[PDB]
Amino acid sequence: RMKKKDEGSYDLGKKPIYKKAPTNEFYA
Amino acid sequence: RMKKKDEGSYDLGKKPIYKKAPTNEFYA
């Protein structure tokens, strides 16, 4: 995550980040 | 994500979710 911009407090702070490879299986 | 509870507006809404398996490699 390079530069950022969250000077507007309202209802958001964390973001999603799906992208791993601990093996070769898909569960959902 | 089962039940939830976000009736407090402030600075959060999305969450992280690292956990994929589109292959067998790790980049970071």
Side-chain angles (χ1 to χ4, degrees):
Chain A
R1 305 197 126 127
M2 69 240 119
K3 262 235 276 224
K4 263 195 175 209
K5 199 108 166 192
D6 54 47
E7 218 178 59
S9 69
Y10 280 117
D11 190 56
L12 165 153
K14 274 148 147 123
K15 306 165 141 202
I17 44 173
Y18 218 88
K19 237 188 201 213
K20 217 175 152 156
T23 184
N24 204 90
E25 206 139 70
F26 209 123
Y27 193 101
Chain B
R1 305 197 126 127
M2 69 239 119
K3 262 235 276 224
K4 263 195 175 209
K5 199 108 166 192
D6 54 47
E7 218 178 59
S9 69
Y10 280 116
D11 190 56
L12 165 153
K14 274 148 147 123
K15 306 165 141 202
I17 44 173
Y18 218 88
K19 238 188 201 213
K20 217 175 152 156
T23 184
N24 204 90
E25 206 139 70
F26 209 123
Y27 193 101

